[PDB]
Design a protein around this ligand. Structure first.
Ligand SMILES: [Zn+2]
Ligand SMILES: [Zn+2]
Ligand SMILES: [Zn+2]
Ligand SMILES: [Zn+2]
Ligand SMILES: [Zn+2]
Ligand SMILES: [Zn+2]
Ligand SMILES: [Zn+2]
Ligand SMILES: [Zn+2]
Lengths: 81, 79, 81, 79
DNA sequence: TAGAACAAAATGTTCT
DNA sequence: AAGAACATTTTGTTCT
DNA sequence: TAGAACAAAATGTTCT
DNA sequence: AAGAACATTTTGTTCT
């Protein structure tokens, strides 16, 4: 494919285990390494697309996790082999 | 009463016709003057409070307008 | 510019401090991290271009050093600032 | 005498007409059959020895030909 | 592919 | 009340 | 930009 | 002597 699985923007490649765009890559990195005590202003199912992905970091981060992103994807796939 | 009518933060006074905080005051001026077009990612009914107000500029802006904010609120001292 | 300063092939970017192609980048990395007890079969001035860069690793590595390549270029340029 | 005439490594016998090592033997067959065109990076006079022979296929190949290597050296038992 | 560094966008505060 | 300036936070791009 | 991992090219050894 | 097969070393590319 070539859609980011988090926001549907065009994927820049496979990051942290999942096809994503560059903005979602660095978003997940920052969320995972820091705090991500984010608060949804809707019902925890906000739509995350190219334009709206800035709206709700709580839902964007939930979508990163649901897509399967994980910081150790590279080293984990090396073990699996 | 010291409570922003848009986000319930502590209000700094009457801005553009409405009791608001400083952050909502300037957010509103920017929204109108930049005339940007925001889009809600929920259901057009997001909770707008001191922290969540950052999440949905579309609903925050809508609440400003609904609360009566108007850049020429003062100039409307017409007789 | 856009010539590799080591072999004159097209540069892929600035690596280890110097504009180089990808083949020269990984060549220098391997030479620096391992042994580079290479022996020139000419007079230590072999010509290193796209086709001949495979011929003499001793001279190719000398050219990497002469161009200024160094493993810590990134962290070194951070200190300088 | 057990010394490769191309690289002075220890020779394994007469290959393609010339006393050579195994590595020079197969290098020569590959050069001729792949018919590749090598280029020297020095002065067409590189030192070819057990270790340096890897550096200049052009001079190594030239030395093979000059030493008399020929893939049909055996078949040249013509009367 | 992962990540540093730079850049930009978006928001908030101070001060007049 | 209103706004400019600065500051911070949040997000996105380049890596010549 | 740095680097892991994969891939290819180039060389050398064994075995018949 | 000659060569195929395998093995190793050296070099280069992709990273869906
Ligand atoms: Zn994305
Ligand atoms: Zn949400
Ligand atoms: Zn407010
Ligand atoms: Zn909303
Ligand atoms: Zn190069
Ligand atoms: Zn040389
Ligand atoms: Zn030899
Ligand atoms: Zn030569």
């Amino acid at each position: 494919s070539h859609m980011c699985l988090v926001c549907s923007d065009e994927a820049s490649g496979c990051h942290y285990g999942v096809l994503t765009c560059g903005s979602c890559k660095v978003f997940f990195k920052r969320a995972v390494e820091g705090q991500h005590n984010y608060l949804c202003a809707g019902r925890n199912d906000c739509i995350i697309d190219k334009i709206r992905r800035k709206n709700c970091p709580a839902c964007r981060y939930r979508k990163c996790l649901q897509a399967g992103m994980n910081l150790e994807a590279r080293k984990t796939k090396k073990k699996i082999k």
